[PDB]
Design a protein around this motif. Structure first.
Motif, PDB file in Angstrom:
ATOM      1  N   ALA B 115       0.838  -1.188   0.000  1.00 42.95           N
ATOM      2  CA  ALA B 115       0.000   0.000   0.000  1.00 42.95           C
ATOM      3  C   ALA B 115       0.872   1.236   0.000  1.00 42.95           C
ATOM      4  O   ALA B 115       1.835   1.336   0.758  1.00 42.95           O
ATOM      5  CB  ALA B 115      -0.927   0.008   1.202  1.00 42.95           C
ATOM      6  N   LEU B 116       0.520   2.176  -0.860  1.00 45.48           N
ATOM      7  CA  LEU B 116       1.244   3.422  -0.992  1.00 45.48           C
ATOM      8  C   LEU B 116       0.276   4.535  -0.618  1.00 45.48           C
ATOM      9  O   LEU B 116      -0.820   4.613  -1.160  1.00 45.48           O
ATOM     10  CB  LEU B 116       1.723   3.583  -2.438  1.00 45.48           C
ATOM     11  CG  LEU B 116       3.064   2.983  -2.879  1.00 45.48           C
ATOM     12  CD1 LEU B 116       3.526   1.830  -2.021  1.00 45.48           C
ATOM     13  CD2 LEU B 116       3.021   2.577  -4.352  1.00 45.48           C
ATOM     14  N   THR B 117       0.681   5.397   0.305  1.00 46.01           N
ATOM     15  CA  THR B 117      -0.235   6.369   0.874  1.00 46.01           C
ATOM     16  C   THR B 117       0.316   7.780   0.817  1.00 46.01           C
ATOM     17  O   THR B 117       1.460   8.027   1.185  1.00 46.01           O
ATOM     18  CB  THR B 117      -0.565   6.019   2.341  1.00 46.01           C
ATOM     19  OG1 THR B 117      -1.146   4.710   2.397  1.00 46.01           O
ATOM     20  CG2 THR B 117      -1.540   7.019   2.927  1.00 46.01           C
ATOM     21  N   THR B 176      -6.558  15.574   2.799  1.00 49.34           N
ATOM     22  CA  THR B 176      -6.893  14.660   1.714  1.00 49.34           C
ATOM     23  C   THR B 176      -5.918  13.488   1.686  1.00 49.34           C
ATOM     24  O   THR B 176      -4.708  13.677   1.731  1.00 49.34           O
ATOM     25  CB  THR B 176      -6.889  15.358   0.351  1.00 49.34           C
ATOM     26  OG1 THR B 176      -7.702  16.534   0.417  1.00 49.34           O
ATOM     27  CG2 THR B 176      -7.443  14.432  -0.712  1.00 49.34           C
ATOM     28  N   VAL B 177      -6.451  12.276   1.618  1.00 50.36           N
ATOM     29  CA  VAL B 177      -5.635  11.078   1.708  1.00 50.36           C
ATOM     30  C   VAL B 177      -5.911  10.178   0.516  1.00 50.36           C
ATOM     31  O   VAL B 177      -7.063   9.912   0.188  1.00 50.36           O
ATOM     32  CB  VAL B 177      -5.941  10.294   3.005  1.00 50.36           C
ATOM     33  CG1 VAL B 177      -5.073   9.046   3.101  1.00 50.36           C
ATOM     34  CG2 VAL B 177      -5.746  11.180   4.229  1.00 50.36           C
ATOM     35  N   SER B 178      -4.858   9.715  -0.144  1.00 43.40           N
ATOM     36  CA  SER B 178      -5.041   8.777  -1.238  1.00 43.40           C
ATOM     37  C   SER B 178      -4.184   7.545  -1.015  1.00 43.40           C
ATOM     38  O   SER B 178      -3.039   7.640  -0.583  1.00 43.40           O
ATOM     39  CB  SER B 178      -4.723   9.422  -2.589  1.00 43.40           C
ATOM     40  OG  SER B 178      -5.120   8.577  -3.657  1.00 43.40           O
ATOM     41  N   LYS B 179      -4.758   6.386  -1.295  1.00 42.43           N
ATOM     42  CA  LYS B 179      -4.057   5.131  -1.120  1.00 42.43           C
ATOM     43  C   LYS B 179      -4.163   4.319  -2.398  1.00 42.43           C
ATOM     44  O   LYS B 179      -5.262   4.027  -2.884  1.00 42.43           O
ATOM     45  CB  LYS B 179      -4.613   4.346   0.063  1.00 42.43           C
ATOM     46  CG  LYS B 179      -3.800   3.114   0.429  1.00 42.43           C
ATOM     47  CD  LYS B 179      -4.422   2.370   1.610  1.00 42.43           C
ATOM     48  CE  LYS B 179      -5.737   1.688   1.227  1.00 42.43           C
ATOM     49  NZ  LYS B 179      -6.221   0.756   2.290  1.00 42.43           N
ATOM     50  N   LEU B 180      -2.997   4.000  -2.947  1.00 47.11           N
ATOM     51  CA  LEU B 180      -2.864   3.144  -4.106  1.00 47.11           C
ATOM     52  C   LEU B 180      -2.376   1.802  -3.601  1.00 47.11           C
ATOM     53  O   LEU B 180      -1.293   1.698  -3.035  1.00 47.11           O
ATOM     54  CB  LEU B 180      -1.837   3.728  -5.079  1.00 47.11           C
ATOM     55  CG  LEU B 180      -1.392   2.848  -6.250  1.00 47.11           C
ATOM     56  CD1 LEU B 180      -2.526   2.662  -7.239  1.00 47.11           C
ATOM     57  CD2 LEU B 180      -0.175   3.440  -6.935  1.00 47.11           C
ATOM     58  N   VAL B 181      -3.184   0.773  -3.790  1.00 48.33           N
ATOM     59  CA  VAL B 181      -2.776  -0.553  -3.385  1.00 48.33           C
ATOM     60  C   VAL B 181      -2.425  -1.413  -4.587  1.00 48.33           C
ATOM     61  O   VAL B 181      -3.260  -1.669  -5.478  1.00 48.33           O
ATOM     62  CB  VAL B 181      -3.822  -1.255  -2.497  1.00 48.33           C
ATOM     63  CG1 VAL B 181      -3.355  -2.666  -2.164  1.00 48.33           C
ATOM     64  CG2 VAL B 181      -4.049  -0.451  -1.227  1.00 48.33           C
ATOM     65  N   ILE B 182      -1.165  -1.834  -4.575  1.00 47.83           N
ATOM     66  CA  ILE B 182      -0.582  -2.736  -5.546  1.00 47.83           C
ATOM     67  C   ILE B 182      -0.753  -4.174  -5.081  1.00 47.83           C
ATOM     68  O   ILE B 182      -0.232  -4.588  -4.034  1.00 47.83           O
ATOM     69  CB  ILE B 182       0.909  -2.445  -5.704  1.00 47.83           C
ATOM     70  CG1 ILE B 182       1.105  -1.005  -6.167  1.00 47.83           C
ATOM     71  CG2 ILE B 182       1.550  -3.437  -6.657  1.00 47.83           C
ATOM     72  CD1 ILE B 182       2.537  -0.578  -6.155  1.00 47.83           C
ATOM     73  N   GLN B 183      -1.488  -4.925  -5.886  1.00 45.49           N
ATOM     74  CA  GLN B 183      -1.902  -6.275  -5.564  1.00 45.49           C
ATOM     75  C   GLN B 183      -0.711  -7.226  -5.501  1.00 45.49           C
ATOM     76  O   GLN B 183      -0.672  -8.134  -4.671  1.00 45.49           O
ATOM     77  CB  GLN B 183      -2.891  -6.732  -6.632  1.00 45.49           C
ATOM     78  CG  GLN B 183      -3.629  -8.009  -6.337  1.00 45.49           C
ATOM     79  CD  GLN B 183      -4.733  -8.254  -7.343  1.00 45.49           C
ATOM     80  OE1 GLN B 183      -5.905  -8.331  -6.982  1.00 45.49           O
ATOM     81  NE2 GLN B 183      -4.362  -8.369  -8.619  1.00 45.49           N
TER      82      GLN B 183
END
Ligand SMILES: *[C@@H]1O[C@H](CO)[C@@H](O)[C@H](O)[C@H]1NC(C)=O
Ligand SMILES: *[C@@H]1O[C@H](CO)[C@@H](O)[C@H](O)[C@H]1NC(C)=O
Ligand SMILES: *[C@@H]1O[C@H](CO)[C@@H](O)[C@H](O)[C@H]1NC(C)=O
Ligand SMILES: *[C@@H]1O[C@H](CO)[C@@H](O)[C@H](O)[C@H]1NC(C)=O
Lengths: 213, 213
Positions: B115-117, B176-183
């Motif tokens: 997870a990248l936040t 503001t928070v964004s989370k990119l989750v790499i499977q």
């Protein structure tokens, strides 16, 4: 004998300390001279604007940027007298844990491996970060609870895979970093990392809420 | 007719904007009066010290704390004249991504979920965070590279489990928070999150270095 002179020295010197945020900070000297000499204050080589006293340079409000070398230059041209004195300003900074400013997970998957990280900067740099834990229960005795225990291998609420502390270069600053790795997220708990230097302390609370999916 | 008067109005008003860090910010009014009236500047109800002009209040250096309601009070006691005028100061803040200030992993385990936040605060609050990626290759065309691609489901360098953006309360601020989750961390790459409002932009680079253990 009526002869002109310029004598200048530190009150104690050469180093003066102030904490970031302090207002009206005096950089003083012991100055005895006759006749009244001409003078000019400098910081790190560059002159300073405004009306000043040769007895003390007053900084309105200090920040970490206020750190540096302040120099009083004195001269009596007609007498051929010259005197330079330098004062080293050190501005201390109460430590901050940066992860506090960022979002943090509310839920942790049971049995999973989890890393908890605290990054701290301050002046002076704190050289250690202390980890503490407490049960997932309400507090009777309350920023304070009375059941906090240091994190050790003995009687851990969750098994600890590791606990490392190092120095890392981050955003143009040397910073102290500690990582507590929990091998298995068995039970909900509260963790905190605490950091301190001589001018302050900081804490980050981690609500280690654990559920099964 | 020789009669006393006090007239005051905004140059445009009632709202004035400045960016955090701006120096010598003027809060001006259009003031015509006779005889010269008595006056007093206030901020959010409390008086202000120092010599001021009734034509403009000068703020030495604005911060986010400079935001508020500034009020000019004017009166001619003998004439029985009173006039109050209020100016709304809004201090904009260029956005910051907080994870930048904290330590970040140098290595990622292959095939693993990651997870990248990115957490961003600013004034006005940025409402979106954009994710971009580029290969784990040197840059020919250089804070800039020319091969950055937006992160989408189409042609992803690593499979994306999710990409969510929300608002979260952190350290007394809405953020503001964004989370990119790499499977699956299949391949090394570079990611970045970019955030912007009308007075600035910020970027966090993530060196997604992947190895097998
Ligand atoms: C005092 O400081 C000034 C400014 O740096 C320098 O030019 C000068 O040579 C110094 N004078 C003495 C007495 O050392
Ligand atoms: C950080 O630490 C390194 C290694 O000791 C040191 O050489 C360097 O001066 C420090 N950098 C800064 C910017 O403080
Ligand atoms: C102007 O402001 C002062 C300070 O808040 C207040 O006491 C006073 O009533 C106001 N006068 C007028 C003309 O509204
Ligand atoms: C944050 O958002 C909430 C929900 O809209 C809002 O009610 C609140 O005023 C905001 N809080 C702050 C401190 O800006």
């Amino acid at each position: 004998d009526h002869n002109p002179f310029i004598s200048v020295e530190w009150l104690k010197g050469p180093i003066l300390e102030a904490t970031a945020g302090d207002e009206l900070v005096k950089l003083p000297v012991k100055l005895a001279a006759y006749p009244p000499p001409e003078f000019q204050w400098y910081k790190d080589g560059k002159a300073l604007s405004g009306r000043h006293s040769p007895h003390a340079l007053v900084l309105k409000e200090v920040t970490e940027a206020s750190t540096g070398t302040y120099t009083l230059a004195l001269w009596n041209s007609a007498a051929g007298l010259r005197r330079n004195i330098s004062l080293e300003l050190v501005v201390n900074v109460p430590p901050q844990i940066h992860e506090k400013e960022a979002s943090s997970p509310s839920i942790y998957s049971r049995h999973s491996r989890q890393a908890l990280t605290c990054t701290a900067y301050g002046v002076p740099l704190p050289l250690s970060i202390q980890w503490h834990w407490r049960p997932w229960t309400p507090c009777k005795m309350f920023p304070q609870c009375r059941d906090w225990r240091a994190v050790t291998t003995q009687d851990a609420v969750n098994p600890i895979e590791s606990l490392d502390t190092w120095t890392e270069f981050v955003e143009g600053k040397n910073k102290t970093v500690s990582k507590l790795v929990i091998q298995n997220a068995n039970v909900s708990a509260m963790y905190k990392c605490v950091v301190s230097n001589k001018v302050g302390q900081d804490e980050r609370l981690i609500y280690f809420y654990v559920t099964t999916h």
